[PDB]
């Protein structure tokens, strides 16, 4: 798989167990971003997985 990572542009508070909460600056590994506008992510600071809203992130590296 890809080793690219994304960075959060804003804080986000999850509204459901399926979705991550994250902080601005958090580095997120995307497992998939080809099925819809919410992407399947892995936090490289908490280790949790969950969906994130793709408008809240940008590529970092």
């Amino acid at each position: 798989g890809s080793h690219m990572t994304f960075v959060a542009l804003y804080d986000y508070e999850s509204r459901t167990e399926e979705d991550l909460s994250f902080k601005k600056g958090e580095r997120l590994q995307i497992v998939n971003n080809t099925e819809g506008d919410w992407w399947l992510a892995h936090s490289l600071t908490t280790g949790r997985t969950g969906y994130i809203p793709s408008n809240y992130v940008a590529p970092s590296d």
């Binding site: 542009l9 804003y10 804080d11 986000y12 399926e18 998939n32 099925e35 819809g36 506008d37 919410w38 992407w39 399947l40 969906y51 809203p53 793709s54 408008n55 809240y56």
Partner: peptide
């Protein structure tokens, strides 16, 4: 059913 296919939330 897909969890990816939801509308995006507003930026804050």
């Amino acid at each position: 059913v897909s969890l990816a296919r939801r509308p995006l939330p507003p930026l804050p």
